[PDB]
Every structure is written in C-alpha cells, then in structure tokens.
C-alpha cells in the first residue's frame, strides 16, 4: 500500500483473526504487526 | 438500508418463476460427425476453385 | 398609428374554449434493472452489482419519477377533499354539460369527451398484464409490441385510475357548477351559475351585467364550442397530437429500448450464451465482461434522455398544478397564462397519461373607433372617473372598461376633483 | 374525502356572518450543499 | 393574489423563519367560518329608473329592503348616498320597486 | 390589436401598482424630462 | 408532529445522502480487479495496469 | 470501415442525431413561442 498522511495511534477492537482490512470507501483501516500493537487507519496529510 | 422504515409504499424487487429441471429435445441418433473425414483428406483444391 | 384624439375598444367577443392540451404524466416506467440488463440470469445480475450503485439510484430516479407522477395526479386532481357527488341534471342555466359529466350508460366511469380521448390514443398493448400476467406460456403472440419480457417495463396503472380521475373530476366539476372559488379553500360553499358566472367574468374586469342578458348567447357559444371540439376530435388528429406525441416519443423510446435490446454494440450476438459454458475461464469470462459492458450504458442514457423529459413533464404538471389552481380552484390574472386570451374558467376532461384542460377563455372579435377626452373641465376643476378610459360618439362622452364597451352616464356622483383645468394639458369644456 | 350536497338556485347569496384565522407552515427546498470537487486527487485514488 | 400559491382563502403574509439549507413560511391564512342563505336582486327600482349599488349588495329579510358591502353581513339602511342611477326598471330582471 | 391614446395609458400603466393616476397624468413634461434623462443614463450605460 | 419541515429535511437527506452515495460507489468495481487504487497498483505492472 | 463499426452501436446515435436535430428545431420553436407571437406585422408609427 502507498499512504499520504498522518499517522496515529489507534485502540480498535482486534483478533489475529482480524489482521487485515480497509474501509466501506476502501481507505486503510486495519492494520496489526508485532513492532507496534496499536492499529491504524490513515488519516490524510491535512489535504484540501 | 436502514433499519428504520417511514410510511409509503416502497418499490423493492419482481420476481419470476424457478424452473424444475433441465429438459433437453437432442436428436436421438448416434453418429460421430464428419468433422473426422473432412479434415482428414488427402486432396485438397486450390484457393480459386 | 398611436392615435392622441382616438381610441379603439373591443365591442364583441367569442366564447372560445381554447383546448390546451398538456402531459401531466407519462407512462409510469418503473424498470427492475436486473429485467432490462439481464432478462431473466443472474450472472449478469452479480455483473451489474460489480457496478453496484448505478441502478439502485436509476430505479429509485425512476420510482421518484413515479412517485413524482403521482405527486403531479395529487396536486392536480386530488385539491381537495371535499367531494360533491354527480348532481342530477337540473337548473344550470342551459349550459350543456352532457360530454363531461360521467356517462350512466356505459359500466366504466368515463365521459364522452373521455371515451373520445381514450380511444385515440394507441397505448401499443402497453401494460403489465398483457405481456406478462397469462403468458407462462404462448399467449398472444405477433403483438404489437414484442419481447417486453426481456425488458421487464413494469408499466403501472396510476394510482387514481380514470374512474377514479373521473371521480375527482367530477367533484372538482360540481365545485365548479355549485361553488366559487370557495371550494378549495377548506369549507366548501354553495352558490348558483349567475352569480358564480358573474364572479368569473368579475375577476378580469369585465363587468357581471352583460352576462344576465346574454346567458343564452354565452351558453348556446360554448355548446356549440364544446361540439365544435367534439367534431374536431372525430375528424382530425391534431388538437390530441400533443399528447400523441408524448405517447409516440414515449413509446417510440421504448421500442427503441428494445431496439438497444436488439443490438450488438460491437459484440457478436444479443444473447449472452457464448462464454457461459463448461471451459476454464482465468481470461475467457473477461470478454463477454466487456461485451455485456458495451449492453449495459444504454439505461442510463434512456433514462436521463427520460429523467431530462421527466423534469419537463414536471415543468408542465407543476404548470398543470399551478392551471387546476389558478383557473378551476381560482382564476388566473396572469396574460396569456390559462390558454390564450382572457381566462374564464377551465374543466379537466381527463386523457391517457395526460390532461385536457378546456380552458374556456374570453377573447375579444370585433373592434371600432371613438373619439375621446382627458378629462372634463366642469366648473374650474379637473373631473376624473372611477374606472376606465373615455370614450365618445363625437359629441357624448363614455367611459369604458378595456375588454367589453359599456357607456356610462356622465352624472354627478361619477366624477370626482383631483386637479384643476390648467394644469391639465387640452382638457375638453 | 366526504359527500356533500349539490343545491343550485336563482338568485341566492351567502354574506358571511363570523371568521376564522388559521394559521400554517409551507416549506421549500431554497439552496443546496456547496459542493465542489478537486478532479485530479479525488479520482484514482490519493497518488497523482 | 394567486391562488394556492402562497394563499388560502385569503393571503395576508408571511414570516422568512430560516432553516439549514432553505426557509420555512408561515401563512396567516383565512376561512369564512358561517354563511347563511339570503334573497338579493341585481337592481333596486325607485322612479322607473334602475339604481345600482356602488360597493354594495341589495339583501332583504324578507319585508324590506336593506344594503351592506359583499365581505361582512351588518346590512345598512338604503340610501341615496349609496345607490346610484343607471339605467331604468324595465331591462332588470328580477327588480323590485 | 387597437390603438389608446397615449398619456391616457400613462395614465392608467402604473393602476396595477396601486398609487392613483395623477403621478405621471399631470406632470407629462416634467417626469417626461425624468424618464428623458433615464433613457440618457441608460444609453450612456449601455453603450459605454 | 415530524410531518411539519418534510421537505426541507427532504433536501437535507438528498443533499446529504448523495454525497454518501457518491462516497459509497468508490467501493464499486466497475469491471476492474478491485475498486481500491492500492491492489492495483501493487497487484500488477504498469503497461498490464 | 469506421461507419460500419459506427452502424454496428444500433441506435446511440441514431438517437443523438434525432436529439441535435431535436435541440435544433426546439431553437426554432422556441424562436416560435418568444418572437413570433403574433405572425402578422404591424407598421413602425411616425415620430410624432
């Protein structure tokens, strides 16, 4: 995936099951990975 | 595409009727087709002819 | 030219029922998507969800347009709901009424004027249960139209149907036989045909004494108006060719709906049989992807080609709402609005997915000249009317309303002071 | 609706003797959404 | 003054109260409560000469004579203020001396 | 068609406004010279 | 009663829910592998893409 | 070979070439229903 924004932690409800996912408008939405637990969903860079 | 449904009369989908089984009219002879004899000859003719 | 010491008022008049004829609806196309782009298969239905929000929108634009023509049926017909029932023929004046009144003979509830309107226009065999509802089997076949069943034209009837357009016509009728304007606004009146004539010929500035000894005259015009329509309506088609046009270009759009049934667009055949069968298809379903593709755009250029007429049909109906409320719930001051010439009244013979309203309108024939003055210069002070320019015969002087010659006696109470006679520039002794 | 009567006459008038004011809302759709679209980053994703 | 546009009954007017994305009217409409059956000619007949009423209706309970505006029934007495000459009896349908 | 002389229908042009007929009957010259001076600022306005 | 304002909500929601539909059809395909930009791009080669 | 590729499409634009035609005569019509709305012509009056 290629991402232009700004990145936060988020504190979703989450599985193993769950790993991986994107939006009903099809954005990044779900994200898990053993560096970092939080998940993440990119919010644009401010854009408009 | 909401669980809340106001009052009117609302337009959702038709229908047609489900068929029963598959009825197939073949013609009830068996023979292989010419399809082996025909490319399988040993004269051919020339293109304008 | 612009004549300073003459003046021209018109004398005489005909009674001229002027038909305009205007589509209030249309015929009520609801199409399944999955009807018209796929017939009766689904796989092409899974096709037409990958787009996934085009026809849900195409099939609620139509089902807005429907809901819309039924919208465009209540604020014409459905003004109010106070319904007074078909009277007995008695005590209207000698205005013949027979052709719009409901018929007792015939089992259905539609006029003369009626059954001429609806036996003219061809509807083409146009409904649901025609094509549809008998055939399971070979019902009918060589129709005058064809192959609706893989189109899918749930054509519905409208929700007031022409017994019951007939019903509210009616009502809206004997509101306009035995009440004013009154009718509509709420709690309903009573009031007889000199009077309530007498209150439409006021609103336009015609005086309401010229109907009392003219009643005959008037009645025995739009009779003869009312046959003339009739004669007309028996002998050539183009009073109707307006609405036989809206039904000629509507179904002309959907035997050319079925025409892009017809065609290929590029593909090799109108059916979709050619990949569905037993190969592997990692690339083969991928062409008939593309060639349903090339089927599927057809839709949505009929229905905004349909949804730009739909907005016209809704610019006439909002018209059409705007006439039933302005010329049979009211009358109209706006030139030529209601017809043209000066409105009168209007009924609402109803037509196949249209109206017809006889827009009875007052227009003016004849015409002569008189001499006229400013203003009479009685004892120092400028005199002046109370409604109307002057006229005259050379000698004597009248005053008279733009539409109708009346003359009025010069007297004492009539003329009031608003200036005096030498600011009044060629003011008459 | 309900039915009413149909009484046709000569010369017959109704003056009114007492008036009811009434009072009630219309509404109208006026203005719409200000909506407007760059067409460059919106379609095919947010890479140029 | 057009018909169910904006009026009912009357039109008298309106107040613009706003709203997100249009306005709201609000009609102070008008409806003739009760009306009761009378007996009116178009004309009345003094000297064999028509008068006719300026603003006015010529209604009678029944022995007399009396003249009140078409909008609000308080009949008043007939007068010569109030009635003008035009014309004289023997054209009016209806008249009475 | 017909033919109304013209400071009479003047006089009677603004009657559906609602103020009576002496604004512009008795002062023909006068908002005739205002109406003059109107056209020349329209013309100055519209051909410039 | 809410029968009072209903056109005027009738606008908010087709203003409202038209932007939505027009956010909600980028999740449609349109004959594509994907309605996403991102399998697009990484799924294939750019003369093939 | 491109018109019979461009027959090959049914009616498209069949229908666009009765829809420009119809664009055309509605000009015309609406040339009609502004301009003439009388077809008879009155003559210009003298400057007096």
């Given at each position: 995936?290629?991402?232009?924004?700004?990145?936060?932690?988020?504190?979703?409800?989450?599985?193993?099951?769950?790993?991986?996912?994107?939006?009903?408008?099809?954005?990044?939405?779900?994200?898990?990975?053993?560096?970092?637990?939080?998940?993440?969903?990119?919010?644009?860079?401010?854009?408009? | 595409?909401?669980?809340?449904?106001?009052?009117?009369?609302?337009?959702?989908?038709?229908?047609?009727?489900?068929?029963?089984?598959?009825?197939?009219?073949?013609?009830?002879?068996?023979?292989?087709?010419?399809?082996?004899?025909?490319?399988?000859?040993?004269?051919?003719?020339?293109?304008?002819? | 030219?612009?004549?300073?010491?003459?003046?021209?008022?018109?004398?005489?008049?005909?009674?001229?029922?002027?038909?305009?004829?205007?589509?209030?609806?249309?015929?009520?196309?609801?199409?399944?998507?999955?009807?018209?782009?796929?017939?009766?298969?689904?796989?092409?239905?899974?096709?037409?969800?990958?787009?996934?929000?085009?026809?849900?929108?195409?099939?609620?634009?139509?089902?807005?347009?429907?809901?819309?023509?039924?919208?465009?049926?209540?604020?014409?017909?459905?003004?109010?709901?106070?319904?007074?029932?078909?009277?007995?023929?008695?005590?209207?004046?000698?205005?013949?009424?027979?052709?719009?009144?409901p018929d007792?003979?015939?089992?259905s509830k539609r006029s003369?004027?009626?059954?001429?309107?609806?036996?003219?226009?061809?509807?083409?065999?146009?409904?649901?249960?025609?094509?549809?509802?008998?055939?399971?089997?070979?019902?009918?076949?060589?129709?005058?139209?064809?192959?609706?069943?893989?189109?899918?034209?749930?054509?519905?009837?409208?929700?007031?149907?022409d017994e019951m357009?007939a019903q509210?016509?009616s009502?809206?009728?004997?509101?306009?036989?035995?009440?004013?304007?009154?009718?509509?606004?709420?709690?309903?009146?009573?009031?007889?045909?000199?009077?309530?004539?007498?209150?439409?010929?006021?609103?336009?500035?015609?005086?309401?004494?010229?109907?009392?000894?003219?009643?005959?005259?008037?009645?025995?015009?739009?009779?003869?108006?009312?046959?003339?329509?009739?004669?007309?309506?028996?002998?050539?088609?183009?009073?109707?060719?307006?609405?036989?046009?809206?039904?000629?270009?509507?179904?002309?759009?959907?035997?050319?709906?079925?025409?892009?049934?017809?065609?290929?667009?590029?593909?090799?055949?109108?059916?979709?049989?050619?990949?569905?069968?037993?190969?592997?298809?990692?690339?083969?379903?991928?062409?008939?992807?593309?060639?349903?593709?090339?089927?599927?755009?057809?839709?949505?250029?009929?229905?905004?080609?349909?949804?730009?007429?739909?907005?016209?049909?809704?610019?006439?109906?909002?018209?059409?709402?705007?006439?039933?409320?302005?010329?049979?719930?009211?009358?109209?001051?706006?030139?030529?609005?209601?017809?043209?010439?000066?409105?009168?009244?209007?009924?609402?013979?109803?037509?196949?997915?249209?109206?017809?309203?006889?827009?009875?309108?007052?227009?003016?024939?004849?015409?002569?000249?008189?001499?006229?003055?400013?203003?009479?210069?009685?004892?120092?002070?400028?005199?002046?009317?109370?409604?109307?320019?002057?006229?005259?015969?050379?000698?004597?002087?009248?005053?008279?309303?733009?539409?109708?010659?009346?003359?009025?006696?010069?007297?004492?109470?009539?003329?009031?002071?608003?200036?005096?006679?030498?600011?009044?520039?060629?003011?008459?002794? | 609706?309900?039915?009413?009567?149909?009484?046709?006459?000569?010369?017959?008038?109704?003056?009114?003797?007492?008036?009811?004011?009434?009072?009630?809302?219309?509404?109208?759709?006026?203005?719409?959404?200000?909506?407007?679209?760059?067409?460059?980053?919106?379609?095919?994703?947010?890479?140029?």
């Amino acid at each position: 995936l290629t991402g232009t924004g700004v990145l936060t932690e988020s504190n979703k409800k989450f599985l193993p099951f769950q790993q991986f996912g994107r939006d009903i408008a099809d954005t990044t939405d779900a994200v898990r990975d053993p560096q970092t637990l939080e998940i993440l969903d990119i919010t644009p860079c401010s854009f408009g | 595409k909401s669980f809340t449904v106001e009052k009117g009369i609302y337009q959702t989908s038709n229908f047609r009727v489900q068929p029963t089984e598959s009825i197939v009219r073949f013609p009830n002879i068996t023979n292989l087709c010419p399809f082996g004899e025909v490319f399988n000859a040993t004269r051919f003719a020339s293109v304008y002819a | 030219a612009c004549s300073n010491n003459s003046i021209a008022i018109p004398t005489n008049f005909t009674i001229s029922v002027t038909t305009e004829i205007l589509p209030v609806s249309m015929t009520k196309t609801s199409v399944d998507c999955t009807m018209y782009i796929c017939g009766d298969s689904t796989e092409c239905s899974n096709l037409l969800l990958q787009y996934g929000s085009f026809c849900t929108q195409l099939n609620r634009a139509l089902t807005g347009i429907a809901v819309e023509q039924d919208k465009n049926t209540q604020e014409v017909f459905a003004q109010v709901k106070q319904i007074y029932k078909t009277p007995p023929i008695k005590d209207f004046g000698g205005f013949n009424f027979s052709q719009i009144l409901p018929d007792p003979s015939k089992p259905s509830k539609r006029s003369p004027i009626e059954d001429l309107l609806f036996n003219k226009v061809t509807l083409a065999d146009a409904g649901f249960i025609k094509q549809y509802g008998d055939c399971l089997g070979d019902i009918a076949a060589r129709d005058l139209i064809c192959a609706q069943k893989f189109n899918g034209l749930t054509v519905l009837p409208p929700l007031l149907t022409d017994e019951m357009i007939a019903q509210y016509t009616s009502a809206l009728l004997a509101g306009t036989i035995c009440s004013g304007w009154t009718f509509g606004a709420g709690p309903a009146l009573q009031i007889p045909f000199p009077m309530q004539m007498a209150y439409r010929f006021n609103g336009i500035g015609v005086t309401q004494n010229v109907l009392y000894e003219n009643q005959k005259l008037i009645a025995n015009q739009f009779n003869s108006a009312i046959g003339k329509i009739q004669d007309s309506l028996s002998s050539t088609p183009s009073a109707l060719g307006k609405l036989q046009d809206v039904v000629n270009q509507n179904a002309q759009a959907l035997n050319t709906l079925v025409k892009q049934l017809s065609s290929n667009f590029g593909a090799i055949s109108s059916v979709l049989n050619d990949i569905l069968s037993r190969l592997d298809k990692p690339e083969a379903e991928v062409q008939i992807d593309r060639l349903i593709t090339g089927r599927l755009q057809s839709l949505q250029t009929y229905v905004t080609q349909q949804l730009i007429r739909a907005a016209e049909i809704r610019a006439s109906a909002n018209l059409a709402a705007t006439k039933m409320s302005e010329c049979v719930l009211g009358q109209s001051k706006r030139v030529d609005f209601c017809g043209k010439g000066y409105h009168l009244m209007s009924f609402p013979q109803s037509a196949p997915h249209g109206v017809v309203f006889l827009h009875v309108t007052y227009v003016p024939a004849q015409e002569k000249n008189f001499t006229t003055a400013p203003a009479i210069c009685h004892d120092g002070k400028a005199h002046f009317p109370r409604e109307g320019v002057f006229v005259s015969n050379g000698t004597h002087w009248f005053v008279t309303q733009r539409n109708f010659y009346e003359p009025q006696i010069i007297t004492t109470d009539n003329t009031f002071v608003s200036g005096n006679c030498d600011v009044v520039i060629g003011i008459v002794n | 609706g309900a039915e009413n009567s149909v009484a046709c006459s000569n010369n017959s008038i109704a003056i009114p003797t007492n008036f009811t004011i009434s009072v009630t809302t219309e509404i109208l759709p006026v203005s719409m959404t200000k909506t407007s679209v760059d067409c460059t980053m919106y379609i095919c994703g947010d890479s140029t």
